[model samples]
Target: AACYSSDCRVKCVAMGFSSGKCINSKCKCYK
Candidate 1:
């Protein structure tokens, strides 16, 4: 599934990541 920046940010924040983004159409979470 393709991921959006908004979705990634919410997911990352909930999952305890410092931030998140969409890279290559995928969700990438970063600490």
Candidate 2:
């Protein structure tokens, strides 16, 4: 399984992204 939706927020933070969301069932973070 992979990180999804808000689950990516932490990932985003770690990546220095402002926020995170689920795209195509995948986690994506953007500023």
Q: Give one digit per residue, the lDDT tens place, for model 2 in 1-31.
A: 5766767887897889898987877887889
lDDT tens digits, residue span 1-31, model 1: 8898998999999999999999999999999
Best by TM-score: 1
Global lDDT of each model? 0.93, 0.81
- Candidate 2 residue spans exceeding 4 A from truth: none
- Model 2 misses residue 8 by how many Å? 0.8
Q: For each predicted model, how many residue pairs clash, with residues at least 3 apart or on different chains?
A: 0, 0
